[PDB]
Design a protein around this nucleic acid. Sequence first.
RNA 1: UAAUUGCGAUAACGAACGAGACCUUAACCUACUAAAUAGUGGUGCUAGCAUUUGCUGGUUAUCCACUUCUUAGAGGGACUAUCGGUUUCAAGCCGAUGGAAGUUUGAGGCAAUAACAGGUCUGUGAUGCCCUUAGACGUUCUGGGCCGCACGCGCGCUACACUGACGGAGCCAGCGAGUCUAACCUUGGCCGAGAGGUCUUGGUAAUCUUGUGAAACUCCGUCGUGCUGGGGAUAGAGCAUUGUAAUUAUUGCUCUUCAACGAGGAAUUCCUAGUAAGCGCAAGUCAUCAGCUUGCGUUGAUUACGUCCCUGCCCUUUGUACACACC
Lengths: 60, 70, 80, 55, 206, 141, 63, 145, 67, 143
Amino acid sequence: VLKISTRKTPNGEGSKTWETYEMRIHKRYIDLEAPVQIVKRITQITIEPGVDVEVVVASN
Amino acid sequence: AQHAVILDQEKYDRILKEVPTYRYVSVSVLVDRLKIGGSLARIALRHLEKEGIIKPISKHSKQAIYTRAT
Amino acid sequence: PGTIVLYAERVQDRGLSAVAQAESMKFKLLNGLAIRRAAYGVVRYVMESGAKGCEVVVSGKLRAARAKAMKFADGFLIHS
Amino acid sequence: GNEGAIRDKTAGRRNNRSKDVTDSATTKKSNTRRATDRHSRTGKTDTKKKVNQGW
Amino acid sequence: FTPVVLATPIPEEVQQAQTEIKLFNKWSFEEVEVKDASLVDYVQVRQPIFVAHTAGRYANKRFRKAQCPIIERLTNSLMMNGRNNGKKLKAVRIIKHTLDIINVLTDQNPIQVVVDAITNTGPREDTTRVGGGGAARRQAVDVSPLRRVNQAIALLTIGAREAAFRNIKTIAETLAEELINAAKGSSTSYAIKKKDELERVAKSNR
Amino acid sequence: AVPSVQTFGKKKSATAVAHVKAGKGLIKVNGSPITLVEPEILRFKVYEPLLLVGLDKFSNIDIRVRVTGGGHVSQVYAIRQAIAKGLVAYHQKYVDEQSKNELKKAFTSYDRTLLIADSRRPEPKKFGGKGARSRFQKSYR
Amino acid sequence: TPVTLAKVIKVLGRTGSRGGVTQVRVEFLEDTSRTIVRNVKGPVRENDILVLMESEREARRLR
Amino acid sequence: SLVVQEQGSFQHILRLLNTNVDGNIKIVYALTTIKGVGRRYSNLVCKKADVDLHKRAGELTQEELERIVQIMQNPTHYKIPAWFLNRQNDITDGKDYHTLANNVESKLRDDLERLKKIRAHRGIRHFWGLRVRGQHTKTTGRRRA
Amino acid sequence: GRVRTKTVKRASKALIERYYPKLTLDFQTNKRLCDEIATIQSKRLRNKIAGYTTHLMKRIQKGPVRG
Amino acid sequence: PGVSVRDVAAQDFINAYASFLQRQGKLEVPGYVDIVKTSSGNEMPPQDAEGWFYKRAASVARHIYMRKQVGVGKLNKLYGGAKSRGVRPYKHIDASGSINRKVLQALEKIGIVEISPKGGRRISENGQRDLDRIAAQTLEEDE
RNA sequence: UAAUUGCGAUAACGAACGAGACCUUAACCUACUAAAUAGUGGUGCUAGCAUUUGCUGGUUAUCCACUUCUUAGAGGGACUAUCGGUUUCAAGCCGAUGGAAGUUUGAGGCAAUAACAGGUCUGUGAUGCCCUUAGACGUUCUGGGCCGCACGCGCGCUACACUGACGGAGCCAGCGAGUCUAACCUUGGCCGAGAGGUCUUGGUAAUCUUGUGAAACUCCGUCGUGCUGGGGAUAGAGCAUUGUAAUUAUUGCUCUUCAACGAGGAAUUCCUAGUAAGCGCAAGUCAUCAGCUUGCGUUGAUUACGUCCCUGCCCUUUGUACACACC
Ligand SMILES: [Mg+2]
Ligand SMILES: [Mg+2]
Ligand SMILES: [Mg+2]
Ligand SMILES: [Mg+2]
Ligand SMILES: [Mg+2]
Ligand SMILES: [Mg+2]
Ligand SMILES: [Mg+2]
Ligand SMILES: [Mg+2]
Ligand SMILES: [Mg+2]
Ligand SMILES: [Mg+2]
Ligand SMILES: [Mg+2]
Ligand SMILES: [Mg+2]
Ligand SMILES: [Mg+2]
Ligand SMILES: [Mg+2]
Ligand SMILES: [Mg+2]
Ligand SMILES: [Mg+2]
Ligand SMILES: [Mg+2]
Ligand SMILES: [Mg+2]
Ligand SMILES: [Mg+2]
Ligand SMILES: [Mg+2]
Ligand SMILES: [Mg+2]
Ligand SMILES: [Mg+2]
Ligand SMILES: [Mg+2]
Ligand SMILES: [Mg+2]
Ligand SMILES: [Mg+2]
Ligand SMILES: [Mg+2]
Ligand SMILES: [Mg+2]
Ligand SMILES: [Mg+2]
Ligand SMILES: [Mg+2]
Ligand SMILES: [Mg+2]
Ligand SMILES: [Mg+2]
Ligand SMILES: [Mg+2]
Ligand SMILES: [Mg+2]
Ligand SMILES: [Mg+2]
């Protein structure tokens, strides 16, 4: 959870009110044993705006 | 300065003949008996326990506590 | 080159589009309309596009030196 | 320069310490104007025609 | 008491007093009684306790404060004057010591002595600043039992602390001095004085 | 595999897990005997369950506890809770109900939360004071 | 010295300008069948025991 | 430690480095009432001198006191590091001194004078009775001189 | 201060009005009822509703209630 | 019965081992000891004067026995506390890496600890040996 | 009632904005779905101590199983429940039991209508008008200044010690954050009294720093009421770090110098439970600089659970020649 904590005023006057925004970052991983064909199929599709999909490989 | 930092032989004997009736003895009590400051009075505490009078009934830094021998 | 691509896309009714309706007021006034005509029209059109309610505020200054504001609501809104 | 600055009596602390302190040191806020805040100075006024044309 | 043991073993006096009687640091809760009718109900004693520490929820309701074990109330009230706020381990130990000390002098369950200086210090009546018009006289009041216990603890520990300040005598010693001088009321204790005076003025203005 | 349960205890943010299995009667904490512990004044607080319910009781069982989190007092309350909870969890699967309920009885009766977790927790500070309720300081003018 | 013990039987309300005082009807113990109204100083509930320092005298209002 | 004795042996008050030193204080600290002997310095010097710090200023042989002085004013010889010293790298002969007693006053005089004589801002600043280490002077120290 | 808002009290009224047989001085079942039988959007508000309609029933049982 | 150090309370152990390493006479004491501080965060040097290097030795050792591996950094962080920055708030500060590092090198030469892989310093098997031994000894005084 | 929150009274009946609902976070799930970027039990490889089983560790994979603890999806849970007092037996309030939880569950986010000549043109390539525009009020470069010191005011930090300072030793958090076309978070090894240096290293991170072994705190010692070993202002000398630059001393270290301050007049701030107070940490700022802020956890009380006396504010009734509305 990314917090940013700022004065509400653009200037200085007023009781000193503070405000705090957040961007919630959710991360997940699914491990899969397969051949080339199914990975390529499954990952070109399942495409989605907003979801960052990354496929790696290997064991190191 | 105002006194009780050495031992003046008379003081030692004083310590040996004054420490019964002291149901309570501690660092504080020894000072209160118009003598030994909490330096050498601590030594007095260790050295009445050399053998005799003081019976150790409590433990530590700041607080010590003993009673007349039996 | 080619690793980025643009498409246009008409919007399903500009009527429930705050941004469109604001830009529309901007244009109404800028195109030298009236004040209440512009606003009441935007509103009547938003309503007519089947909204639950809508509200238009005009703040600042028109023609007289001193500033003024105006609320122009119709229908139903919730605020909290 | 620096020779000047050390050699200049009428300088340093003792000298200030021995002077009286002004009264505007221990002053107060000032304020100047406030119960005029609602009273427009512009002397101009608008007018019902111009306002009705505007709004 | 029938000893018993297993792998990692449990010390003698430990096993002993533990399973048998349910007593304090190691002082009796049985016996120990409140020599002033009333005050019972506002001085605990039984349920008995091992040391005066507890994750106690004694605040969230108006009177449940009463139910907190007295000794622990005393230690609680020890841990103030800014520098010491919090610091219950400090306080608790100061009490263990205090009770050892008090015990040395004149026997008695020292927890019984504490109980006595508490009974013997709460003002039976006092005063408040009633108006009655600008020049405010003082209307005598009879004070609650709860207020009496409270104020007794307050007084006892304050006087004990104020005494203890800036001299070689240590907190537990002077706390025990106040406790003792107060338990059988002797006008050499800050507490007893303050009670006696509160009631002096409280008489003086009825 | 022998008979065995796991339990835990929780005061503030400290958490203390208990593994309570069939054994010849150990009672260790992190990796030392329950006799060490120190806090020390507070030592009896962790003995407390054993003496409430009779020292025997632990002779058919090995007990181990590990606390992470909280701080010194915080950890004492958590470990004790975990131990008593433990013992009861074990009588519930292996011994008979009536025994377990007699143990809940003697804990729950005297108590100090032993079986139930204290819900008190930090309240968040809010801008305008160094604390949650504490407000800063004003002068007016 | 003559102590007198009384049991709170009814809580009447708060007096005093500040409002920290509480009016109470008490039935004294060493011989009931007689009630008096006193003014407290602490927090008080039904069935507490006040030590009336002087046995006969009672108040009402408080400013 | 141990219940002790002695006789007329220890004389209260004793005078070294042109100053006075009370008996009946724990010696390490006695040495402190001299100028230029902070608690550390005293501690290390006493350890170097081969003395029982458990002693008062009280006891102590005359001999012992002598050694104590010798080391106090010749630190570098009796292997005391030199980062332990109040005046390393003179500024003329460049040796390292641990200036002591009635002489540290002089050395302060000396340094301040050097600054003034060279017209350096720090000097002027000193001469003016002001703060020299750059602190704001609006608000603090007004009880002053 | 635990006083029930209009929407809650209104809903208890209407429900008891039209589903009194079914309902029964038990919150636990009146709850489930409310699920099967009306459409609410928060668990919380539904519970609040049930519990109050349960109260209202529980006291109708001993003489009528206005409204 | 069988024994570890975990069966022995901090203080009487570490003092047992202090007195031991002391007695022994094999050690290594840098030499700057007595003339040195233990941390910039401190006012005075240790009061044990002759010794205390044995005290830290014991402490360090037991700390390393009770876990996988530890370096100089972690010890500095450990052995350090609050430094009064005089009139400006207290802040934790690390202790000296010399004292510690030298202590490690000492106990190692005495074969009671060893450069571990992974990093740091692992207790030696002969460390296990000797520590469990004096632990036992300390419970034996208590008998 | 916290609430134009409700009951009730009733020429009103029935509703909508706002309050409430809603949302977020903290609490409870041996029920659900799982996990070598979280962990537990068994097993192997193995160290030490006892030896009679045992006890305490090592071993990011040597394998097997699990999901109590950790993570976050989906659910469930509470509705002031049950009982009893009290009340116009109404809405409610109180006590007891149960309960993770019963003060709007705790704490926040959102938040109607209206008002102010409140603050902001110095956040904006938001902007009207006025000014200025090459001897510039554009801009950049060098250097100084915002820190200047008889003194008045505010927020603060550290103290006056013995519930303490010092010294060993014990030794436990939570919220964060970190380097690509770069030099950020840094473990470990050595060197160094320290600050720091140097060689390597892990990490674009539940993986590494980091269990952030934080501080108050606990324990065994030293001191012993003495401006004392409380206090650490001021000042001298030396050493290092950031930076093109450290003088008016960025900051860090060592030695030395050792002030006022012995609990603070009239006044005045803040606060009701994991709260107050004490205590540290991370984040913002940041090349370097926190005595500031914003959050965080640790230790953890005394006292109310009331009122209208002070103060402040809302509401009726009432007067008005005010309506640009008592400026
Ligand atoms: Mg709404
Ligand atoms: Mg906090
Ligand atoms: Mg000196
Ligand atoms: Mg330490
Ligand atoms: Mg530490
Ligand atoms: Mg409200
Ligand atoms: Mg066998
Ligand atoms: Mg075997
Ligand atoms: Mg789970
Ligand atoms: Mg309950
Ligand atoms: Mg909530
Ligand atoms: Mg204005
Ligand atoms: Mg602007
Ligand atoms: Mg402009
Ligand atoms: Mg800006
Ligand atoms: Mg803009
Ligand atoms: Mg310009
Ligand atoms: Mg400025
Ligand atoms: Mg001001
Ligand atoms: Mg302010
Ligand atoms: Mg310490
Ligand atoms: Mg060097
Ligand atoms: Mg790398
Ligand atoms: Mg952690
Ligand atoms: Mg003084
Ligand atoms: Mg000091
Ligand atoms: Mg400069
Ligand atoms: Mg300047
Ligand atoms: Mg001094
Ligand atoms: Mg004060
Ligand atoms: Mg700067
Ligand atoms: Mg910072
Ligand atoms: Mg700032
Ligand atoms: Mg009239």
